[PDB]
Amino acid sequence: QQTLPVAEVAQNLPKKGYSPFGTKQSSVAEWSLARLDDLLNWGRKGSIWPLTFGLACCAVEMMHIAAPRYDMDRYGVVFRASPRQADVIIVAGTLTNKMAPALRKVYDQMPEPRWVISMGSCANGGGYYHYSYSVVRGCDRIIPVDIYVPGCPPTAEALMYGVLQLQKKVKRMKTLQMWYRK
Amino acid sequence: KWYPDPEFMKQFSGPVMYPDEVTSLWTVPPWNSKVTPVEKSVRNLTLNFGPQHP
Numbered sequence: 005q006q007t008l009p010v011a012e013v014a015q016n017l018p019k020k021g022y023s024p025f026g027t028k029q030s031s032v033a034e035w036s037l038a039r040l041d042d043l044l045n046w047g048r049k050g051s052i053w054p055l056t057f058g059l060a061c062c063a064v065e066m067m068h069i070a071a072p073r074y075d076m077d078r079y080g081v082v083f084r085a086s087p088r089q090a091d092v093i094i095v096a097g098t099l100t101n102k103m104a105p106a107l108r109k110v111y112d113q114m115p116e117p118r119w120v121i122s123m124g125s126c127a128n129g130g131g132y133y134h135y136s137y138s139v140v141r142g143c144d145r146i147i148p149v150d151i152y153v154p155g156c157p158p159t160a161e162a163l164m165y166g167v168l169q170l171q172k173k174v175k176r177m178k179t180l181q182m183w184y185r186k
Numbered sequence: 187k188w189y190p191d192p193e194f195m196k197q198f199s200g201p202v203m204y205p206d207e208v209t210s211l212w213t214v215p216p217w218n219s220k221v222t223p224v225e226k227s228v229r230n231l232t233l234n235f236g237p238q239h240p
């Protein structure tokens with residue numbers, strides 16, 4: 005476990021930079037590829053489009069986030085209905101066996117780079133129905149989950165905090181910079 | 187006296203009065219000449235509306 009620095013330590017330290025990669029690149033190609041990754045991540049970070057799967061009980065919070073108290077399009081997030089145009093999927097609610105193939109199908113019909121947020125306990129690990137004959141214990145067993153938002157349901161603040169955490173993950177992803185090594 | 191007999195009336199009554207290998211084969215005499223249509227099965231379109239649907 006680590007802890008935040010103290011006031012004087014902050015005073016010594018410089019600006020934390022903007023691109024999470026930093027600005028230590030050696031050669032022209034390195035420095036150039038650093039910027040292009042930064043632009044790409046900036047695009048994919050600023051504009052992110054959930055699919056609004058929202059099966060149950062959790063869905064109500066998935067709507068309150070769209071509501072005008074913790075506005076989410078403020079951050080550049082919009083609910084596109086069509087999975088071909090949706091970039092992110094907030095799986096929320098329980099995943100019953102009847103639904104499992106449906107979720108799988110919806111997921112891979114969506115084009116990548118696709119990130120999944122598992123909202124609520126029901127999706128995270130099956131939640132409160134974990135020992136049930138009809139529920140997928142978690143949603144990790146159908147799809148690759150990216151961010152877990154604990155809660156039952158998570159308070160709207162918690163959900164969109166997780167969204168920002170996804171934005172941070174979208175910010176630090178290294179595709180061009182490290183293709184250069186590939 | 188000979189009168190027109192069923193043999194004489196069978197001289198005609200084919201699709202061709204001099205039946206051949208094909209006309210004699212298939213015959214379509216709907217006497218009324220007004221054949222009713224026979225209803226078909228017009229299968230409809232299927233939509234799996236939902237679940238992924240607002």
Ligand code: SF4
Pocket residue numbers: 060061062096097098123124125126127131132155156157158
């Ligand atoms: S995790 Fe909680 S809020 Fe979400 S669907 Fe299950 S019971 Fe409802």
